[PDB]
Design a protein around this ligand. Sequence first.
Ligand SMILES: Cc1c(C)c2c3c4c1OP(=O)(O)Oc1c(C)c(C)c5c(c1C4)Cc1c(c(c(C)c(C)c1OP(=O)(O)O5)OP(=O)(O)O2)C3
Ligand SMILES: Cc1c(C)c2c3c4c1OP(=O)(O)Oc1c(C)c(C)c5c(c1C4)Cc1c(c(c(C)c(C)c1OP(=O)(O)O5)OP(=O)(O)O2)C3
Ligand SMILES: OC[C@@]1(O)OC[C@@H](O)[C@@H](O)[C@@H]1O
Ligand SMILES: OC[C@@]1(O)OC[C@@H](O)[C@@H](O)[C@@H]1O
Ligand SMILES: [Zn+2]
Ligand SMILES: [Zn+2]
Ligand SMILES: [Zn+2]
Ligand SMILES: [Zn+2]
Length: 90
Amino acid sequence: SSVQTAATSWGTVPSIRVYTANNGKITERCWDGKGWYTGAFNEPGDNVSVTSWLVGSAIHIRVYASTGTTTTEWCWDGNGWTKGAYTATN
Ligand SMILES: Cc1c(C)c2c3c4c1OP(=O)(O)Oc1c(C)c(C)c5c(c1C4)Cc1c(c(c(C)c(C)c1OP(=O)(O)O5)OP(=O)(O)O2)C3
Ligand SMILES: Cc1c(C)c2c3c4c1OP(=O)(O)Oc1c(C)c(C)c5c(c1C4)Cc1c(c(c(C)c(C)c1OP(=O)(O)O5)OP(=O)(O)O2)C3
Ligand SMILES: OC[C@@]1(O)OC[C@@H](O)[C@@H](O)[C@@H]1O
Ligand SMILES: OC[C@@]1(O)OC[C@@H](O)[C@@H](O)[C@@H]1O
Ligand SMILES: [Zn+2]
Ligand SMILES: [Zn+2]
Ligand SMILES: [Zn+2]
Ligand SMILES: [Zn+2]
């Protein structure tokens, strides 16, 4: 078995974020033009997907973390990771 990843990027530098699900936990690695460093994201999950969009130069990141049949959305909007309103019936 193997770790599972999800990736997003934005701009032309670019910024890149790679999320890795390992051991029921998702962590984050970051590229902003000058080497890979560890990001603030740390949430439970066996499976991860991600999307992001810009408003002007402000990134908005949504990470979908799944454990069992429960998927939780995590939101980055410039000032801390918050829990999003996403729900599903799995
Ligand atoms: C935590 C975890 C994940 C995230 C998994 C799988 C397993 C898993 O539980 P684990 O405790 O590792 O138990 C297993 C052990 C010990 C072995 C030896 C296994 C498998 C599993 C089951 C089956 C398995 C799985 C795979 C993939 C890609 C392979 C090749 C694969 O066969 P292989 O590695 O020979 O055989 O999918 P993936 O890794 O994404 O999903 C399924
Ligand atoms: C507790 C447990 C259950 C109930 C599972 C699975 C696993 C499992 O974890 P574990 O056995 O510790 O880790 C694995 C290990 C050590 C190996 C070598 C595995 C698998 C697993 C994953 C993958 C796997 C699973 C299967 C089936 C039918 C096969 C053939 C099957 O490939 P197999 O050649 O055995 O590879 O479904 P099953 O209903 O058994 O579901 C999936
Ligand atoms: O500059 C790094 C950082 O703030 O970028 C936005 C998000 O990816 C955060 O988790 C991360 O720590
Ligand atoms: O600002 C957070 C939020 O409203 O952003 C858009 C969607 O991701 C929603 O689920 C989420 O709660
Ligand atoms: Zn393996
Ligand atoms: Zn898988
Ligand atoms: Zn687990
Ligand atoms: Zn905004």
